Amino acid sequence: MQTFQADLAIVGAGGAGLRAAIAAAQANPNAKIALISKVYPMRSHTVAAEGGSAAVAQDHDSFEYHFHDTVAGGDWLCEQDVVDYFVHHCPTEMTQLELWGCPWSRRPDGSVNVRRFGGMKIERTWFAADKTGFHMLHTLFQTSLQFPQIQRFDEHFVLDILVDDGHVRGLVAMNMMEGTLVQIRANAVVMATGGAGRVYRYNTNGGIVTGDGMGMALSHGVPLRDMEFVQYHPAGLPGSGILMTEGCRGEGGIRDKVSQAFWHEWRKGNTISTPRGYLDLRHLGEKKLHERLPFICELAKAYVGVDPVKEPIPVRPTAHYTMGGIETDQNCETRIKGLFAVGECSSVGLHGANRLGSNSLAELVVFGRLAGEQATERAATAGNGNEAAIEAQAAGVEQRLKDLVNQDGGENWAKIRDEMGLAMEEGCGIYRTPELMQKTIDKLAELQERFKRVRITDTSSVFNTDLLYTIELGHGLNVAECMAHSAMARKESRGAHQRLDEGCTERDDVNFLKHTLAFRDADGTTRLEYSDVKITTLPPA
Amino acid sequence: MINPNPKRSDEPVFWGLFGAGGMWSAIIAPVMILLVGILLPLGLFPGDALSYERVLAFAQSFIGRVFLFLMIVLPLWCGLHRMHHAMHDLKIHVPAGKWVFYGLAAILTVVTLIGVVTI
Amino acid sequence: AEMKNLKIEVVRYNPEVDTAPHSAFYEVPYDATTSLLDALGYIKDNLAPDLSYRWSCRMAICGSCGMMVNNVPKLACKTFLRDYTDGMKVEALANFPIERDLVVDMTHFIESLEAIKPYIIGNSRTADQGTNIQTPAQMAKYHQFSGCINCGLCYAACPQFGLNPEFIGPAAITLAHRYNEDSRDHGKKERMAQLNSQNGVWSCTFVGYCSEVCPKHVDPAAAIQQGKVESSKDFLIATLKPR
Amino acid sequence: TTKRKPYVRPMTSTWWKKLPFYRFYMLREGTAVPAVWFSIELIFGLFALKNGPEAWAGFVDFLQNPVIVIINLITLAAALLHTKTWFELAPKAANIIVKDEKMGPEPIIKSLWAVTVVATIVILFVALYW
Ligand SMILES: Cc1cc2nc3c(=O)[nH]c(=O)nc-3n(C[C@H](O)[C@H](O)[C@H](O)COP(=O)(O)OP(=O)(O)OC[C@H]3O[C@@H](n4cnc5c(N)ncnc54)[C@H](O)[C@@H]3O)c2cc1C
Ligand code: SF4
């Protein structure tokens, strides 16, 4: 078990991750930071964002304006002191990025131009054409390169985190190419692995958005806050679930109203059968479609034989953003000393019951910075640990893995995967019922079981993906169960979470203006608890 | 890996000439081939336009010597240049091809010069 | 309705068993909406679970799709079987060291992006000051070069590179030229040394194929060319500094 | 020890014969052969013109040989392919912004042809009218 030493380690190299790495670097120049990712950083999902990142910028705007737009949107389930913090720091991050080369689209004036996105009263969405995600990630990634302190571990799949006596001490990961186990020592780990959008049978996320990390914290007695909320995107193409942006409609482009209408059209015979689930833009015209949706047009022509300027794109809502994640304090820290979760994999308590368009990226650069910052501090304050316990731990991993490999049963992991996605699409959809919801929990547990009869027919060592997709599936199930259970329990209707059963169809601020915590025990059963939301200046009503 | 302090190449020099050569033979070569390679030998021209007497008369004019020179020389450097990389492209080994190809060019330069510098 | 079935060929290679790559053939169902990255998914899931390959975006923005189709560098996600009913051969990215099946060793690639210092340099302006002022006009100066997704395909295309793996490579140069061109940058000197090497812009004979194959239309050939005029310019001044 | 053994496909000196794009390339950079042969004749004539009056008649009668004629007809077609391609690649060495947009090669290209056109008429005019 080769042993690598570092000051603080970071799993994941998306926008949030890399932002975390760079500040750590800036925070401590003599630091030895370990950056790990199962894919080279430029392929992280952040690269897919097209809208833009938010930050107050116009003179007629204000923080209290942004603040209000955020709580309002999160249906009051937002940790208001966190929102405050977040908001006042967007501008400062958004300037550092430009300052690092990020080509924010400009004004004829020479200044940075902003757009209206996410239905916010006042625009404050900074943008780089409609490739904002791409540009932020690359600028971030490229900026990082200049720092010697940041040691990268490209295509290293993280199996687990070493933890003892309630304090993180490092992690195990697999050198994907060489197929070995690398053991990294650090007194703080930051975790940004991205969302669990691949869980659904239908999503927009990249194939690496399996929410491993989320599952990685669950095993260690950490809860996953407000996991019952999934933000479904309005336009989704078959199989690919390739998105069709929103800004199309502000411009004559042609909601639980249509969402609902086609959804309950499936029970009376009023749905209009199509090959997949008509977006007609014909009338749109070149100039607007190729300036705001050059991406939207090429994926449509590509995967459906449909040109966004000549024919309609066949679509039906698919899963997009996972708000709930690892429970975190105001410093992005978890109930485990030295363990911070930043990015979408976390729950700083920023989005509540519904994320506001373009706030995700902002969050990344905003908390990312803090995430690295507080890590460096707790980093030089950790103090030593019982070496035998740590080392005894790494062995549990190499062993549990061996146990996993030797596992047999003839179950095709890929088939399980399908079924799980298929269950999620039906029981945790735009509209959940105690009836269908139950069915998915049952299906979910059932699969958890079958997961034990899966055999990995591939035993090779150079870049074994058959083995990884499986490990990933492992986490998929686990997290997928908090979502389900969480949802089933929240007997109310809030933002992302919409039920149809008597006495739950409406938002209840009396009994459910609290947070949802799912814990997975060694017994394999998911326990739920409830916490209270921090109000500061904007009480509900 | 990759040399942190690479050897600065001289290519710009030859690319400089080559660049100009290629631009001249692009604009002027065709017509030249035309008159000289096809019109003149088949006598397709008016009276004594392309006859020895008037030709020489042009050849000895300033603008004439200058033109001839470039016309010949220039293309050389554009052409012979390519021919040199032709080797690499074809993975063809040529002993000191650099010198052979470029050398040859430097040779006819002077020769061509002699040709026109005399009369 | 019913669906067609297409016979597809894949150049497999296992460094633990095979001595050299060898072809394999799979029967895959498909339609006008079916893409190759989707065709690859199918197989691993039902025909050979040991098939390895890199992917993720599923939308030609991640740039991990790099692979060979009929001797053409393409992105599997942006490649469709409807166009290959008369045969389809898929091999590991062209001009790279196959590690396993369709996953190749990207080390030199990355090396290159790093060696050219792809980052803003020497701009003292800080967060507080506010954003730097850049007009669309200045921004057009380098905008195009910036759409690079590090997909690997230009290298697989340039013969000069295949002959000369010591060549920093097109994209690499492109990336550089981008930042040189960005008015907000003042670190051009820190990049010239590499760009002026025999393995810099001068390993290029301008075949104009990389620009022909980029799936994002970056037109590196142009960058490289523009880069030549730059280095060709540099060389000049240099011959003039007895300073 | 590692279990990796990287398979490196060899690159042959015939790599270009494969894909037609490579083939069109070789003709361009291969357009140089004729481009020289003509520059060589030029020199023969420059020298031939000066050498002697009677040495000239031999010269013309030389290019008057069917073979030499063809070769030049070729050298000319080549001189146009070259001129054709060269005009298409040139624009790419320039980075020109016109009102917040990097203008393409279509403006430069079309104008290079014009000059080229204007030249020929002149060269031909001066050459045959006096
Ligand atoms: C198509 C699309 C468009 C979007 N558009 C916008 C928008 O316009 N505006 C906005 O505000 N938000 C938008 N979002 C949401 C937002 O982009 C994401 O929430 C955000 O990018 C997530 O970034 P992240 O830093 O948390 O990590 P990600 O970018 O998902 O990266 C996670 C990282 O962790 C690594 N990792 C994962 N598992 C492991 C493992 N086991 N071991 C090692 N490494 C691992 C991955 O390799 C990767 O580097 C969009 C999302 C999608 C899917
Ligand atoms: S130069 Fe273009 S095609 Fe090549 S890797 Fe970069 S983005 Fe891809």
Ligand code: F3S
């Ligand atoms: S085609 Fe190859 S030769 Fe250079 S100009 Fe592009 S990398």
Ligand code: FES
């Ligand atoms: S696999 Fe995402 S870019 Fe092709």
